[PDB]
Amino acid sequence: SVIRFFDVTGLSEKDIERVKEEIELLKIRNEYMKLK
Amino acid sequence: VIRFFDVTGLSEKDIERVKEEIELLKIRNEYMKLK
Amino acid sequence: SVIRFFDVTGLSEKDIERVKEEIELLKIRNEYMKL
Amino acid sequence: SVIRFFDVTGLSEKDIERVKEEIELLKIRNEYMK
Ligand SMILES: [Cl-]
C-alpha cells in the first residue's frame, strides 16, 4: 500500500476523523472510477 | 504533531484536497485562538 | 431531483466549487453502497 | 447575505450536515483572513 505523512499540528481527534473521512470519500470515488 | 494516513490510490489532486481540509481545520482553530 | 438552499455568504466561486465537489463525493458514496 | 441552490438528491440528513460544516469552515477561513 501507500502511506504519507501529514502535519496535523493543532488538530483535535475529532478533526482527524473528519480528515480520515475525506480520505475515504476520495478512495470510494476511485473505487468507482477504476471499474472502467 | 505528525500523523500518517493510508492514501493508497489517491491521485495528486486527491492529496491536495486532503491537505486543504487539514488547513481549513487549522485555521478554524487559530480563528478560535484569536477569539 | 432534490434541491436545497444553503447560505453561502462571503464564499468565493472557488469555495462554492469545493462545496459542489463535496456533494458529488457524498452522492458517490451513496451509489457505492448499492455496489 | 447570499443563498445558493444545490442538487442534493439522495443525501441523508447527516450527509447534508457534512456539507453545511464544510460551508462553515470556508466561512470561518474568510472571517480569519479578515
Ligand atoms: Cl491510516
Side-chain angles (χ1 to χ4, degrees):
Chain A
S1 58
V2 171
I3 290 140
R4 238 199 71 91
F5 277 111
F6 294 82
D7 181 305
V8 292
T9 304
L11 285 216
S12 136
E13 188 69 22
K14 190 186 173 182
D15 300 326
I16 301 285
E17 287 161 8
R18 186 186 181 86
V19 176
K20 292 195 257 190
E21 181 158 336
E22 194 68 22
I23 287 178
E24 198 79 23
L25 283 169
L26 298 162
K27 288 175 168 183
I28 289 173
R29 171 162 70 187
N30 296 340
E31 288 296 296
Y32 233 124
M33 302 188 76
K34 71 167 201 189
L35 299 180
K36 290 165 170 193
Chain B
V1 188
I2 281 160
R3 294 284 269 275
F4 57 89
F5 294 117
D6 184 296
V7 298
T8 309
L10 289 207
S11 66
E12 296 179 20
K13 300 198 188 132
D14 288 338
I15 303 287
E16 298 305 310
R17 190 178 188 82
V18 185
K19 291 175 182 172
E20 295 166 8
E21 189 72 14
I22 295 179
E23 294 178 39
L24 287 173
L25 294 160
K26 289 176 168 172
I27 298 172
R28 184 179 76 194
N29 297 335
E30 292 296 340
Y31 173 88
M32 296 313 213
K33 291 173 183 188
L34 301 183
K35 188 201 173 186
Chain C
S1 290
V2 182
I3 291 200
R4 289 290 92 105
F5 81 88
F6 296 79
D7 190 311
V8 287
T9 305
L11 262 63
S12 79
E13 278 318 299
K14 192 186 169 182
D15 303 329
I16 296 295
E17 299 317 313
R18 188 179 181 90
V19 179
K20 294 186 195 172
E21 188 73 26
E22 191 71 16
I23 295 167
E24 171 80 349
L25 296 172
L26 291 162
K27 293 179 173 189
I28 294 165
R29 183 165 75 180
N30 288 333
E31 290 301 321
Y32 188 72
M33 162 184 28
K34 307 182 180 177
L35 302 162
Chain D
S1 78
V2 160
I3 80 175
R4 278 193 63 161
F5 290 79
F6 299 96
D7 187 308
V8 286
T9 303
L11 268 58
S12 63
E13 287 287 281
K14 177 181 164 182
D15 291 340
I16 296 292
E17 298 158 15
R18 190 183 178 83
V19 175
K20 292 185 188 270
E21 287 154 8
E22 192 67 30
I23 294 162
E24 176 200 8
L25 279 170
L26 292 165
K27 280 184 184 178
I28 282 171
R29 179 172 74 193
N30 298 349
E31 291 305 314
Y32 172 83
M33 300 302 193
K34 301 182 174 172

